[PDB]
Design a protein around this ligand. Structure first.
Ligand SMILES: O=C(NCCCC[C@H](NC(=O)c1cccc(O)c1O)C(=O)O)c1cccc(O)c1O
Ligand SMILES: [Fe+3]
Length: 281
Protein backbone atom coordinates (compact mmCIF):
# COMPACT_ATOMS: atom_id res chain seq x y z
CA UNK A 1 0.00 0.00 0.00
CA UNK A 2 1.22 3.49 -0.95
CA UNK A 3 1.38 5.60 2.22
CA UNK A 4 1.85 9.30 2.94
CA UNK A 5 5.55 10.36 2.98
CA UNK A 6 5.04 12.97 5.73
CA UNK A 7 4.26 12.45 9.38
CA UNK A 8 1.45 14.51 10.96
CA UNK A 9 2.65 15.42 14.44
CA UNK A 10 0.14 16.91 16.88
CA UNK A 11 2.20 18.69 19.53
CA UNK A 12 1.48 21.03 22.43
CA UNK A 13 1.67 24.13 20.17
CA UNK A 14 -0.06 22.85 17.02
CA UNK A 15 0.50 20.34 14.25
CA UNK A 16 3.59 19.92 12.10
CA UNK A 17 4.01 17.94 8.89
CA UNK A 18 7.51 16.46 8.66
CA UNK A 19 9.08 14.23 6.01
CA UNK A 20 9.95 10.86 7.48
CA UNK A 21 13.73 10.70 7.90
CA UNK A 22 14.12 14.49 7.47
CA UNK A 23 17.53 15.56 6.10
CA UNK A 24 18.19 18.90 7.78
CA UNK A 25 17.54 18.67 11.50
CA UNK A 26 17.79 21.71 13.72
CA UNK A 27 17.60 21.36 17.48
CA UNK A 28 16.90 23.98 20.18
CA UNK A 29 16.29 21.41 22.98
CA UNK A 30 19.42 19.75 24.34
CA UNK A 31 17.42 16.74 25.58
CA UNK A 32 16.49 16.13 21.95
CA UNK A 33 20.11 16.75 20.94
CA UNK A 34 21.41 14.08 23.32
CA UNK A 35 18.68 11.74 22.05
CA UNK A 36 19.71 12.18 18.41
CA UNK A 37 23.37 11.76 19.51
CA UNK A 38 22.49 8.50 21.31
CA UNK A 39 20.57 7.24 18.24
CA UNK A 40 23.27 8.17 15.69
CA UNK A 41 20.99 10.71 13.93
CA UNK A 42 22.78 13.46 11.99
CA UNK A 43 22.07 16.99 13.18
CA UNK A 44 22.50 20.09 10.97
CA UNK A 45 22.33 22.99 13.43
CA UNK A 46 21.87 24.02 17.03
CA UNK A 47 22.37 27.15 19.20
CA UNK A 48 26.08 26.91 20.02
CA UNK A 49 26.25 29.95 22.33
CA UNK A 50 25.75 27.79 25.45
CA UNK A 51 26.17 24.03 24.96
CA UNK A 52 26.03 21.54 27.93
CA UNK A 53 29.45 20.12 28.78
CA UNK A 54 28.47 16.50 27.91
CA UNK A 55 27.32 17.68 24.44
CA UNK A 56 30.47 19.73 23.77
CA UNK A 57 31.17 17.86 20.46
CA UNK A 58 28.19 19.84 19.12
CA UNK A 59 30.32 22.99 19.47
CA UNK A 60 32.11 21.78 16.31
CA UNK A 61 32.00 23.96 13.18
CA UNK A 62 30.56 20.84 11.50
CA UNK A 63 27.26 22.09 12.94
CA UNK A 64 25.76 25.38 11.86
CA UNK A 65 25.34 27.89 14.64
CA UNK A 66 21.72 29.06 14.89
CA UNK A 67 22.28 31.30 17.89
CA UNK A 68 21.39 30.98 21.58
CA UNK A 69 18.52 29.21 23.38
CA UNK A 70 16.47 32.41 23.67
CA UNK A 71 17.73 34.16 20.51
CA UNK A 72 17.59 32.08 17.32
CA UNK A 73 19.54 33.31 14.30
CA UNK A 74 16.55 33.51 11.94
CA UNK A 75 18.66 34.58 8.96
CA UNK A 76 20.83 31.48 9.29
CA UNK A 77 17.73 29.30 9.76
CA UNK A 78 16.31 30.81 6.55
CA UNK A 79 19.53 29.92 4.71
CA UNK A 80 19.40 26.34 5.97
CA UNK A 81 15.68 25.79 5.27
CA UNK A 82 15.44 22.91 7.74
CA UNK A 83 13.28 19.84 7.34
CA UNK A 84 12.46 19.98 11.05
CA UNK A 85 13.14 22.30 13.99
CA UNK A 86 12.79 20.89 17.51
CA UNK A 87 11.98 23.37 20.24
CA UNK A 88 10.96 23.35 23.88
CA UNK A 89 9.93 25.80 26.60
CA UNK A 90 12.58 28.50 26.01
CA UNK A 91 11.49 28.96 22.37
CA UNK A 92 7.70 28.67 22.85
CA UNK A 93 7.10 32.39 22.19
CA UNK A 94 9.04 32.06 18.88
CA UNK A 95 6.96 29.15 17.55
CA UNK A 96 5.27 31.07 14.71
CA UNK A 97 8.51 32.72 13.59
CA UNK A 98 10.28 29.36 13.50
CA UNK A 99 7.30 27.70 11.78
CA UNK A 100 7.52 30.15 8.87
CA UNK A 101 11.06 28.85 8.21
CA UNK A 102 10.53 25.09 8.62
CA UNK A 103 8.29 22.42 10.24
CA UNK A 104 8.53 23.03 13.96
CA UNK A 105 7.76 20.46 16.67
CA UNK A 106 7.37 21.46 20.28
CA UNK A 107 8.93 18.63 22.33
CA UNK A 108 9.15 19.98 25.85
CA UNK A 109 8.09 17.62 28.64
CA UNK A 110 4.60 17.98 30.13
CA UNK A 111 5.72 17.71 33.77
CA UNK A 112 2.20 16.90 34.99
CA UNK A 113 2.72 13.59 33.14
CA UNK A 114 6.49 13.29 33.00
CA UNK A 115 6.89 9.61 32.06
CA UNK A 116 4.03 9.53 29.52
CA UNK A 117 5.28 12.77 27.93
CA UNK A 118 8.96 11.73 27.93
CA UNK A 119 8.16 8.36 26.40
CA UNK A 120 5.83 9.89 23.77
CA UNK A 121 8.58 12.34 22.75
CA UNK A 122 11.24 9.66 22.48
CA UNK A 123 8.96 7.31 20.52
CA UNK A 124 8.13 10.13 18.08
CA UNK A 125 11.86 10.69 17.46
CA UNK A 126 12.20 6.91 16.94
CA UNK A 127 9.43 6.87 14.37
CA UNK A 128 10.71 9.95 12.57
CA UNK A 129 14.24 8.52 12.14
CA UNK A 130 13.58 4.75 11.99
CA UNK A 131 15.09 4.23 15.44
CA UNK A 132 12.03 2.69 17.16
CA UNK A 133 14.06 -0.36 18.26
CA UNK A 134 16.90 1.70 19.77
CA UNK A 135 14.43 4.00 21.56
CA UNK A 136 12.44 1.09 23.00
CA UNK A 137 15.66 -0.57 24.25
CA UNK A 138 16.81 2.67 25.84
CA UNK A 139 13.45 3.38 27.48
CA UNK A 140 13.57 -0.19 28.82
CA UNK A 141 17.00 0.50 30.40
CA UNK A 142 15.74 3.72 31.97
CA UNK A 143 12.72 1.90 33.46
CA UNK A 144 15.19 -0.43 35.20
CA UNK A 145 17.03 2.58 36.66
CA UNK A 146 13.71 3.95 37.91
CA UNK A 147 12.72 0.62 39.49
CA UNK A 148 16.05 0.57 41.38
CA UNK A 149 15.61 4.07 42.83
CA UNK A 150 11.89 3.72 43.67
CA UNK A 151 12.81 0.90 46.06
CA UNK A 152 14.73 3.23 48.40
CA UNK A 153 12.59 6.39 48.40
CA UNK A 154 11.25 5.04 51.67
CA UNK A 155 11.06 7.35 54.71
CA UNK A 156 13.26 10.05 53.18
CA UNK A 157 11.71 13.46 52.48
CA UNK A 158 13.42 15.63 49.86
CA UNK A 159 13.23 19.27 48.90
CA UNK A 160 14.36 20.49 45.48
CA UNK A 161 16.15 23.86 45.41
CA UNK A 162 17.65 25.99 42.64
CA UNK A 163 20.22 28.69 43.43
CA UNK A 164 20.77 31.82 41.36
CA UNK A 165 22.10 35.27 42.27
CA UNK A 166 22.43 34.26 45.93
CA UNK A 167 18.68 33.38 46.08
CA UNK A 168 16.77 30.07 46.39
CA UNK A 169 13.62 28.86 44.65
CA UNK A 170 11.84 25.53 45.20
CA UNK A 171 10.14 22.90 43.04
CA UNK A 172 7.73 20.13 43.95
CA UNK A 173 5.40 17.63 42.40
CA UNK A 174 4.30 18.31 38.81
CA UNK A 175 7.03 20.94 38.39
CA UNK A 176 10.07 21.26 36.12
CA UNK A 177 12.02 18.97 38.45
CA UNK A 178 8.99 17.05 39.76
CA UNK A 179 10.31 13.70 38.38
CA UNK A 180 12.33 13.18 41.56
CA UNK A 181 8.98 12.85 43.38
CA UNK A 182 6.60 11.87 40.61
CA UNK A 183 8.72 9.28 38.73
CA UNK A 184 11.42 8.25 41.22
CA UNK A 185 8.99 8.06 44.15
CA UNK A 186 10.93 10.27 46.62
CA UNK A 187 8.43 11.81 49.10
CA UNK A 188 8.18 15.59 49.17
CA UNK A 189 9.24 17.66 52.15
CA UNK A 190 6.36 19.93 51.07
CA UNK A 191 3.73 17.93 49.12
CA UNK A 192 1.48 21.00 48.75
CA UNK A 193 4.15 23.09 46.99
CA UNK A 194 2.70 23.76 43.49
CA UNK A 195 5.21 25.24 41.02
CA UNK A 196 4.66 25.77 37.28
CA UNK A 197 7.25 28.57 36.89
CA UNK A 198 10.46 27.54 34.97
CA UNK A 199 12.64 29.17 37.66
CA UNK A 200 10.72 27.79 40.64
CA UNK A 201 8.97 29.35 43.63
CA UNK A 202 10.98 31.91 45.60
CA UNK A 203 11.48 30.67 49.18
CA UNK A 204 13.33 31.92 52.24
CA UNK A 205 16.13 30.07 54.00
CA UNK A 206 13.78 30.00 57.05
CA UNK A 207 11.26 27.96 55.00
CA UNK A 208 13.94 25.45 54.00
CA UNK A 209 15.00 25.09 57.66
CA UNK A 210 11.39 24.65 58.83
CA UNK A 211 10.70 22.00 56.21
CA UNK A 212 13.91 20.33 57.42
CA UNK A 213 14.17 17.73 54.60
CA UNK A 214 16.21 14.57 54.93
CA UNK A 215 17.60 15.30 51.45
CA UNK A 216 18.29 18.61 49.71
CA UNK A 217 18.58 18.44 45.95
CA UNK A 218 20.33 21.55 44.68
CA UNK A 219 20.62 22.85 41.12
CA UNK A 220 23.31 25.48 40.51
CA UNK A 221 21.73 27.67 37.79
CA UNK A 222 24.51 30.25 37.76
CA UNK A 223 27.05 27.54 36.92
CA UNK A 224 25.49 27.25 33.48
CA UNK A 225 23.84 30.65 32.99
CA UNK A 226 26.78 32.80 34.20
CA UNK A 227 29.56 30.17 34.06
CA UNK A 228 30.24 30.68 37.78
CA UNK A 229 29.17 28.08 40.40
CA UNK A 230 27.36 29.80 43.26
CA UNK A 231 25.24 26.99 44.75
CA UNK A 232 27.55 25.86 47.54
CA UNK A 233 28.38 29.40 48.75
CA UNK A 234 24.65 30.17 48.55
CA UNK A 235 23.20 27.28 50.58
CA UNK A 236 26.02 26.64 53.07
CA UNK A 237 24.54 29.11 55.59
CA UNK A 238 23.66 28.82 59.30
CA UNK A 239 19.82 28.30 58.90
CA UNK A 240 20.49 25.56 56.38
CA UNK A 241 23.18 24.14 58.67
CA UNK A 242 20.31 23.30 61.08
CA UNK A 243 18.74 20.77 58.71
CA UNK A 244 18.98 16.99 58.73
CA UNK A 245 20.06 17.24 55.10
CA UNK A 246 23.14 19.33 55.99
CA UNK A 247 23.96 17.52 59.23
CA UNK A 248 23.70 14.09 57.64
CA UNK A 249 25.67 14.91 54.47
CA UNK A 250 22.55 14.54 52.30
CA UNK A 251 22.92 17.68 50.18
CA UNK A 252 23.00 16.50 46.59
CA UNK A 253 24.34 18.90 43.98
CA UNK A 254 22.69 17.97 40.72
CA UNK A 255 24.68 18.68 37.55
CA UNK A 256 23.00 21.74 35.89
CA UNK A 257 24.49 20.79 32.52
CA UNK A 258 21.98 17.91 32.59
CA UNK A 259 19.18 19.19 34.79
CA UNK A 260 18.93 22.87 33.84
CA UNK A 261 20.46 23.36 30.38
CA UNK A 262 19.10 20.02 29.20
CA UNK A 263 16.63 17.33 30.33
CA UNK A 264 14.04 15.08 28.75
CA UNK A 265 16.44 13.13 26.49
CA UNK A 266 17.57 9.50 26.52
CA UNK A 267 20.99 10.43 27.91
CA UNK A 268 19.96 13.36 30.14
CA UNK A 269 17.11 11.42 31.80
CA UNK A 270 19.37 8.38 32.36
CA UNK A 271 22.16 10.53 33.86
CA UNK A 272 19.71 12.58 35.94
CA UNK A 273 18.42 9.37 37.55
CA UNK A 274 22.01 8.18 38.14
CA UNK A 275 22.68 11.43 39.99
CA UNK A 276 19.61 10.85 42.17
CA UNK A 277 20.53 7.18 42.73
CA UNK A 278 24.02 8.20 43.82
CA UNK A 279 22.68 10.77 46.30
CA UNK A 280 20.14 8.38 47.85
CA UNK A 281 22.13 5.11 47.99
O1 LIG B 1 11.13 31.22 29.05
C1 LIG B 1 12.14 31.00 29.71
N1 LIG B 1 12.87 32.01 30.20
C2 LIG B 1 12.57 33.40 29.94
C3 LIG B 1 13.17 34.30 30.99
C4 LIG B 1 14.65 34.35 30.87
C5 LIG B 1 15.34 35.12 31.99
C6 LIG B 1 16.85 35.21 31.81
N2 LIG B 1 17.41 33.87 31.72
C7 LIG B 1 18.59 33.61 31.15
O2 LIG B 1 19.32 34.51 30.77
C8 LIG B 1 18.85 32.19 30.77
C9 LIG B 1 19.91 31.85 29.92
C10 LIG B 1 20.15 30.57 29.52
C11 LIG B 1 19.29 29.55 29.93
C12 LIG B 1 18.22 29.84 30.75
O3 LIG B 1 17.37 28.84 31.10
C13 LIG B 1 18.00 31.15 31.20
O4 LIG B 1 16.92 31.29 32.05
C14 LIG B 1 17.55 35.97 32.94
O5 LIG B 1 18.05 35.28 33.87
O6 LIG B 1 17.61 37.24 32.85
C15 LIG B 1 12.49 29.60 30.09
C16 LIG B 1 11.65 28.54 29.71
C17 LIG B 1 11.93 27.26 30.09
C18 LIG B 1 13.05 26.98 30.87
C19 LIG B 1 13.89 28.01 31.27
O7 LIG B 1 14.99 27.79 32.09
C20 LIG B 1 13.61 29.32 30.90
O8 LIG B 1 14.50 30.26 31.30
FE1 LIG C 1 16.00 29.52 32.41
Amino acid sequence: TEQAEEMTIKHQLGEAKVKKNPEKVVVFDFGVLDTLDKLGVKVTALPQMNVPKYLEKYKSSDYQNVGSLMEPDFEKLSEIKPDVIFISGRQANLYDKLKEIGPTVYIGIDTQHYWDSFTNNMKLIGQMFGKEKEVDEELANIEKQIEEVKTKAADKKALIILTTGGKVSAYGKGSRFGLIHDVLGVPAADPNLKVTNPHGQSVSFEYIAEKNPDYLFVIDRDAVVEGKPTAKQTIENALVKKTKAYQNGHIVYLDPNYWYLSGGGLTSVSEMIKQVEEGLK
